[PDB]
Amino acid sequence: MSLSVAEKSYLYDSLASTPSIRPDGRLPHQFRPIEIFTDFLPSSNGSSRIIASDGSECIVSIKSKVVDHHVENELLQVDVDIAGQRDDALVVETITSLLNKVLKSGSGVDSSKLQLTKKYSFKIFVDVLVISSHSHPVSLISFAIYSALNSTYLPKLISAFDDLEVEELPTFHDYDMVKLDINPPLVFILAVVGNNMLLDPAANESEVANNGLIISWSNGKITSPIRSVALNDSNVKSFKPHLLKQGLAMVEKYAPDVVRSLENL
Amino acid sequence: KDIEISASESKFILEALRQNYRLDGRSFDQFRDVEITFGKEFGDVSVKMGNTKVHCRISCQIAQPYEDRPFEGLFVISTEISPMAGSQFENGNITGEDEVLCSRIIEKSVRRSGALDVEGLCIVAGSKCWAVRADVHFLDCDGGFIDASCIAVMAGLMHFKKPDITVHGEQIIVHPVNEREPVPLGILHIPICVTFSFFNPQDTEENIKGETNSEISIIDATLKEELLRDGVLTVTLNKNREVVQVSKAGGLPMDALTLMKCCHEAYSIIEKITDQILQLLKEDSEKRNKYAAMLTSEN
Amino acid sequence: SEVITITKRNGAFQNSSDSQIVTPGELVTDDPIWMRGHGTYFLDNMTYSSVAGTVSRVNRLLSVIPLKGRYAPETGDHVVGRIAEVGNKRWKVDIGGKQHAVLMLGSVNLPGGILRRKSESDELQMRSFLKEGDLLNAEVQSLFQDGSASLHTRSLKYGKLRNGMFCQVPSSLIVRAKNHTHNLPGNITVVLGVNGYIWLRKTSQMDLARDTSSWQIYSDENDPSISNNIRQAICRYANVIKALAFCEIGITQQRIVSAYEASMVYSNVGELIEKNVMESIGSDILTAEKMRG
Amino acid sequence: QDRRRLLGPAAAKPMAFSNTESEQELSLHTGFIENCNGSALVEARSLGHQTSLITAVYGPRSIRGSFTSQGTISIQLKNGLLEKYNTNELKEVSSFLMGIFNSVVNLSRYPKSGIDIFVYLTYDKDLTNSQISSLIPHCITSITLALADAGIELVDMAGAGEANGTVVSFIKNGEEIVGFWKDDGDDEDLLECLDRCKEQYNRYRDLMISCLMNQ
Amino acid sequence: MTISQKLHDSILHSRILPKKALKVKAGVRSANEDGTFSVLYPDELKRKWSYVLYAKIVVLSRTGPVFDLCWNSLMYALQSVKLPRAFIDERASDLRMTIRTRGRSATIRETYEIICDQTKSVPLMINAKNIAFASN
Amino acid sequence: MSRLEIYSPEGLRLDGRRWNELRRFESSINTHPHAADGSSYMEQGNNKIITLVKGPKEPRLKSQMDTSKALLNVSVNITKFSKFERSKSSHKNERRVLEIQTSLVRMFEKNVMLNIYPRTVIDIEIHVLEQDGGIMGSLINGITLALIDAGISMFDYISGISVGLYDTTPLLDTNSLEENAMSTVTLGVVGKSEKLSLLLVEDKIPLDRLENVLAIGIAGAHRVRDLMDEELRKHAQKRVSNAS
Amino acid sequence: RRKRLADGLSVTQKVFVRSRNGGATKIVREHYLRSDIPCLSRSCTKCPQIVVPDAQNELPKFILSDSPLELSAPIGKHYVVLDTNVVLQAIDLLENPNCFFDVIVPQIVLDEVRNKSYPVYTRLRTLCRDSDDHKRFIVFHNEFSEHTFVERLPNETINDRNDRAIRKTCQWYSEHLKPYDINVVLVTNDRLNREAATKEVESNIITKSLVQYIELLPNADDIRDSIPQTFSDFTFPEYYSTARVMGGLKNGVLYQGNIQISEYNFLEGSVSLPRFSKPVLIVGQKNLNRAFNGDQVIVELLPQSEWKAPVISDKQRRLLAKDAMIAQRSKKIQPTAKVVYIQRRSWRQYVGQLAPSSVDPQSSSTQNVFVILMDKCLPKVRIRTRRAAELLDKRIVISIDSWPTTHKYPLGHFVRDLGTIESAQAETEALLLEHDVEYRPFSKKVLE
């Protein structure tokens, strides 16, 4: 976006109020209303479809594949597409490289649940198509993936699983699928204005910020990867660390309520 | 890099079609005359239709096949335009559209059609095969390139021969060229493409809701002819009367009944020219062998 | 007492006054007596629509008004421009329509007024008075051969914005009236553009002057004295705009007042974002439309 | 393959092999590249791990795009000889780089002017018998010295310190933090993660200012 | 794009390198008693193998023509190249595999993956009396 | 040799279809109001496409600008999850795709009243989600929505359909299984007419069927723009009845 | 679930996972039901009301007569609907000219054959089109039929819905054939499928087995020897499982080709492998493992303890397989192999002669006989049969049924009744077919 300077003061004024004021005037910890759809690409292991309030729009697909889990290290791959942009661009690649770290195979990912045999397992593909964004889109994108993993079924093993001696070629039933049991993580976008910390920065809120954060939630707690993150670059200011220490529980005592709202079936 | 023509000149040709004239001196449905001449090398030929000049080259070498079809050899056609043939063109734009419009045709005209047996490139399965190469050069444009490159490649395949081979596991014995003869190649069918060139003398609506078909179609647009045409269509056929490809990718709207009526006239054209290649391949090789008769008696 | 609306629906891509409604490619008639205007093309009799829209028959004039499209600029209209670019002595500025408007160099109110006359050094200061993205009040003068039109500020009343906040809507729901600046209890003022652009700010004295210094017409300053009771009252008028926009409501100045007093159920201003509650207040006014007038 | 380079015949392959609190240390040098206007040289060696890298400045270069009020930074991370970090792994750091210097550089001093930053991850030993995360803070130091060499308006000698997979960047002698980076580690080790980073920052900035003021 | 070509050209025109210097004499890693490995190396002489070498030139602070310094810097790198000891397996597990045609079949040859030693190495053989230097 | 059953002597296809039958055909209008004024969704069988249109509006550069008419950009997005087997590499400059990017332009050079939209840009965004064969004519039917989805000036409906040939017998509305099984032709058909926008043949075709083959698809194509029309109209009624 | 089209027409998704090359490849298809499904018979007057032409503009022929073989009430007039298994067991019984003139083929039954055997699937494809005035075979596409289509029930295998749909298939039939009192007879061999209709679970349906159908023919004596079917000194081994041999193929463990079992030595044979030069012998009766000469089999090498001089891991066998090629270059001690799986039987119809020892003169009842084959290399077949005193001085056609574990000689059944031994006409006949000579007259689809 390109906004006007006279706003930019007032916007930086009103949000840095000590009784802090959002432009939509939510409570400082609120998020915005969304819509969450899945299970609609029946060629896929799982699908996902999520709708923002500003009309930002993405769909993440789940295709699987059986693999030898010894010859390959990364058992889980993320691949992202933003509409309107080159492969070479920055915001593409960082968000792309991020969620790989977020879903490292034993960090918050329980790859034993992915394990097929003593020799084989499941290569998965987090495949992402963003129609539109007006935001630093990332914390939206985790949300559909969380539902996408909660909407993913996998075909059932028939034969045994010890292929060291006998080296059997594994066999699946043709109708019987089982849901992937998984504890997927979540990601939250933060922003620091003055002495205030809003949750779910909208694009106007995202513009005026001094600086912002990304905090990895998993397993009912805070975890890594955690990055301080610029939104604009015309208003980048530093920050007291207790404010950084403030936001963590500020996330955390409101995090599972968002989770339980989505842990709701 | 832009060709500039007056709208006065635009109406002029459009009038000439409205009185059934065209500037070259051909009929509407008449094709240029083709000069085919070979260089000394095998797979060497110069092909010329009046103003348009082309040149291509066939070669082959040793490589392994893909994992994809581990049975079969390797083959691809390069058609890189040089701005030598006209100042319109970028230095080797493989990403221009008209280039792709030259590309995918010859891609489908040869590779997906399969005039050439790629399985007859298998020297040894999965180990060593042939990598056969087709570099197309343009020399000077009056259009008909995609018909010219249709011909000149298929001309080149019927003149290339590959040398002699002997296998012992890894001991793969490529023989000297002059002791053991080079061996020509296996052509399943001979495709010939035809450019069709389209001219609305009217507006859009008299093509759209004017029920009266009134649209002139000609063969082998010359350069000035080509710059005003309204639709683009190429069909390709054989001697065995099967249709290789058709491509009308948009442009002017166009009656179906015309197109069959168009494509029948293609058939009688391409057949005569095809056999003209066939004699000249023989006759040059006859001239090769008569000069081979003029060599061994000489030596 | 929440954070986010998370309601779930899984297993689907999607949840799934009479006049002529015509399609492109469709014949209207072939009476030759009719005249052929917008949305219409033809071949000598055959009256052919080109959009999804309505047949308009005006007394011998037949034309097709569409339903979907960008904002149509017309002269004399009161809209809001966001500054796109700066040209030679020209500016480019978004309407929201098809193209930018243009804005001559001397088309603007000078500080000090006309006593400040022309100068060629003014083009050395185009960026002084104006720069990108900024918002203002503009007056639609006249057009070009295509349908692209231009602007100016022939009043003190037109000029660069401050003292508030922008919002935007579809251009359709904004109703036409003989007036466009409106002043609302809460000491604040809506500046409804026609094109779909909406600026709020605090009521000025010049606003107060409408119903009973000059060197500040390119400032980025506000009134420094801005209460939160101003600021939070802005947001309550802010969401109810989008409430009517989500509810597809023609804007009446009174309906906003009716929207505002109906919003006095909820003091939690952050609760003014709910899909249902906006629709509920949207349902309130339409029922309240079935009493008065 | 790639028609623009010499990559050998395709069927070859590279050669293969199989199996048959500590101190960090610097050597910081400027003024050795005549293409640039800011250069900086960094040696690093720590306990199994020896690292050398080059930060290169081009500025202020003209911008053919449009008007801006102020300056604009551009940062490149490129593999050197041996260690090959992943492509998408690179630019994430480049994203993390730019955020800190946008609390450093007086861009308002430099309208319509560009900043080019070339970082050459030239050579690294890791002889130890989040591998990029161990090299973050040294970049910022390597950039700051080169940016002092071009003499650009910088608010602070800002630096980052490292504590075991964690990177925290400071200013004001550590009294504020300007850049935060965290990988896996412990939980609520943050308070110790304040400390060991801070003192390395307290070490490093003194090493930096020695490199220039004594020259 | 000129440079890497131009070097390679006169390196050929230097005639420095007979391909005898690329001839690799691999060993076989004898799976010996109680689970130990010694690589039987033949010495002083069925497939063959060949080293193929690579270079990379990085150029910093270009102040003029570069080609002579491109030349001469390579030359000292050339003399420092050790040839690492390469060996194959005693009997590699990666053996011949068959592929079925539409009625026929063929055999993929056995895949003996050459392995270079972690430790041993030999130097490089040079036509040392042709090692040039550059000057503009 | 195929171990399966192409077309029954009892007249049936894989799902049991006749040779003159269609898949389930579903469109939608204004699928994304917050995104662009052209937003339309296609389901034709399992061919699922999101279709997006931007314009008529200002260019990014004054170089890419004309003082006579509009421009038309085609951006095709084939996902790596579009098929059963997941494709490895990306497609964004694949020469197969660029052909279609050329193709839809020249197909739609001549419906748009180009002169009455000068100095402006039309961008057409494609999102191929689920792929079911018949892929070419699937696109065009999604296009014809999306231009009307903003109500851009035009002449006519334009219909698209791939129709295949098993040995003697035409097959309206083939799938990708049948596509790899036989010879197919796609037709870009304009309105109610007998004039063509797109005509593309890859496979090898005996000449003599072709007139008959071309005579097949029109009745299909006319039933296409048929089913597009009312489906828009019942949407079109839903506006003003609840707008007013 | 399912959805509806405006033509009253149904649409739903049948979806599975392709297990090819061990992959897990999910495959989804849409599915249509129609409501114009013909019952294809003479007597019905409403399925000929819905028949519509093809692309070649033809309305086809409704050939199953009003007049079947009528039987003892409560059979009366009846049609026959089959099992795949009774076809898989008795494919040649179907080819009797003397009987079975009117059979509906269900679509799922058609598919399991196409799942099971390709050239057997040819024969049903052959017979249905080459149905005549006498014998009439149709294929009812019941899962294209709306009124017979079923779904996967919860907690179900694919086998359950197979039997249920066939049961559902028969259920519509008599309902449509109530107006003409031509019944429909469901033939099976499955005892659990012969259990659920004992209570007559939903349909008052004709569930008879083969013999339970065969015992109701007027002429069943001629055909009951075409019904398909201790005896132990040791136990023969078995053939490896599916995942074992597909797990064996890629690793270079297993090998296939063709085998030649000698006549001068019945218990010894070699194969010609693609990896191997010399003919690799397989020695031992257990190692031949009850396959016949000429078949496509899958073999494993034997250890050097069983190699011949004229472990658990496959890590050992491959290194031993390299030692085979060393021993192949020896020609002094050369390796032996054994079969572990059979790639394909080269079975067909077979003609031989019986043993006079196997037959009792005084007996008239059923008895074991062995057939001496015309093939010298292939062993005798125990035939449990009645009319052996007839057929002893007569030529016969059999077909091999199976090989279970115990039987040293396989179970097969007599098929075609040929004629007298060294009569010129019968010895003309088997001289054709055992030399693979076609002789049958040109059928009804030929003369068109």
Short mmCIF file of C-alpha atoms in Angstrom, two decimals, chain A residues 116-226:
data_model
loop_
_atom_site.label_atom_id
_atom_site.label_comp_id
_atom_site.label_asym_id
_atom_site.label_seq_id
_atom_site.Cartn_x
_atom_site.Cartn_y
_atom_site.Cartn_z
CA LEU A 116 5.66 -46.70 7.84
CA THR A 117 8.16 -49.51 8.34
CA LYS A 118 11.57 -50.12 9.79
CA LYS A 119 12.77 -49.13 6.31
CA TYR A 120 10.08 -46.89 4.84
CA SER A 121 7.94 -43.86 5.62
CA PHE A 122 5.89 -41.05 4.14
CA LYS A 123 7.20 -38.08 2.24
CA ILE A 124 4.63 -35.33 2.55
CA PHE A 125 4.28 -32.14 0.54
CA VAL A 126 3.06 -28.90 2.08
CA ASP A 127 2.10 -27.21 -1.16
CA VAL A 128 0.87 -23.66 -0.86
CA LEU A 129 -0.97 -21.34 -3.22
CA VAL A 130 -1.69 -17.83 -1.99
CA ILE A 131 -4.18 -16.01 -4.14
CA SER A 132 -3.86 -12.64 -2.52
CA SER A 133 -2.47 -10.92 0.51
CA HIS A 134 -2.36 -7.45 1.82
CA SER A 135 -0.40 -8.47 4.88
CA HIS A 136 2.81 -10.04 5.93
CA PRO A 137 0.86 -13.19 5.26
CA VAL A 138 2.61 -15.79 7.35
CA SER A 139 0.46 -16.36 10.43
CA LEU A 140 -2.58 -16.82 8.25
CA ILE A 141 -0.75 -19.51 6.33
CA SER A 142 0.00 -21.73 9.31
CA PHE A 143 -3.67 -21.77 10.25
CA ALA A 144 -4.94 -23.53 7.16
CA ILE A 145 -2.04 -25.98 7.34
CA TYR A 146 -3.06 -26.81 10.90
CA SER A 147 -6.49 -27.65 9.59
CA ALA A 148 -4.93 -29.31 6.55
CA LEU A 149 -3.09 -31.79 8.73
CA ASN A 150 -6.33 -32.20 10.63
CA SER A 151 -7.97 -33.06 7.32
CA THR A 152 -5.58 -35.66 6.00
CA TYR A 153 -6.18 -39.39 5.69
CA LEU A 154 -3.64 -42.02 4.75
CA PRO A 155 -4.01 -45.51 3.30
CA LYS A 156 -3.60 -48.44 5.63
CA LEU A 157 -0.59 -50.72 5.89
CA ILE A 158 -1.38 -54.36 5.22
CA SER A 159 1.86 -56.34 5.43
CA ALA A 160 4.56 -56.37 8.10
CA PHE A 161 7.15 -53.69 8.67
CA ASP A 162 10.55 -55.34 9.27
CA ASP A 163 12.34 -55.33 5.93
CA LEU A 164 15.90 -55.81 7.13
CA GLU A 165 15.94 -59.57 6.72
CA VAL A 166 12.95 -60.41 4.57
CA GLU A 167 12.82 -57.05 2.68
CA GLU A 168 9.12 -57.07 1.85
CA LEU A 169 7.58 -54.54 -0.46
CA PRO A 170 4.87 -52.80 1.63
CA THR A 171 1.22 -53.19 0.78
CA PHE A 172 -1.77 -50.91 1.19
CA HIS A 173 -5.48 -51.52 1.25
CA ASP A 174 -7.38 -49.71 -1.45
CA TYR A 175 -10.21 -48.16 0.56
CA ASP A 176 -9.13 -48.10 4.16
CA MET A 177 -7.60 -44.79 5.12
CA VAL A 178 -6.56 -43.63 8.54
CA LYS A 179 -6.22 -40.04 9.71
CA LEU A 180 -2.75 -38.74 10.34
CA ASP A 181 -2.49 -38.23 14.08
CA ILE A 182 -0.29 -35.16 14.44
CA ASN A 183 0.31 -32.15 16.70
CA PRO A 184 0.98 -29.35 14.21
CA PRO A 185 2.39 -25.99 15.31
CA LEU A 186 1.04 -22.46 14.99
CA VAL A 187 2.56 -19.09 14.13
CA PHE A 188 1.56 -15.64 15.29
CA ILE A 189 2.40 -12.24 13.85
CA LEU A 190 3.19 -9.51 16.34
CA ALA A 191 3.98 -5.81 16.21
CA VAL A 192 5.40 -3.22 18.58
CA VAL A 193 4.11 0.34 18.63
CA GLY A 194 5.47 2.62 21.33
CA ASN A 195 4.56 0.73 24.45
CA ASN A 196 1.76 -1.35 22.97
CA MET A 197 1.65 -4.80 21.40
CA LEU A 198 -1.21 -5.65 19.08
CA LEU A 199 -2.19 -9.10 17.98
CA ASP A 200 -3.05 -9.96 14.37
CA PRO A 201 -1.68 -6.78 12.78
CA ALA A 202 -3.87 -5.69 9.92
CA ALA A 203 -2.10 -3.96 7.04
CA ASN A 204 -2.56 -0.47 8.42
CA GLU A 205 -1.45 -1.74 11.83
CA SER A 206 1.29 -3.64 10.03
CA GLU A 207 2.43 -0.49 8.31
CA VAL A 208 2.92 1.88 11.21
CA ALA A 209 4.75 -0.50 13.50
CA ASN A 210 8.16 0.12 14.96
CA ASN A 211 8.99 -3.57 14.76
CA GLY A 212 7.30 -6.95 14.92
CA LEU A 213 7.74 -10.57 15.90
CA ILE A 214 6.95 -14.08 14.81
CA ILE A 215 6.46 -16.58 17.62
CA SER A 216 6.22 -20.30 17.12
CA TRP A 217 3.50 -22.03 19.09
CA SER A 218 3.51 -25.78 19.32
CA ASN A 219 2.27 -28.52 21.61
CA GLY A 220 0.44 -26.12 23.85
CA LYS A 221 3.44 -23.88 24.45
CA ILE A 222 5.92 -21.41 23.05
CA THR A 223 8.77 -22.85 21.00
CA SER A 224 11.27 -22.07 18.28
CA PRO A 225 11.66 -20.67 15.48
CA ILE A 226 11.27 -17.12 16.74
#
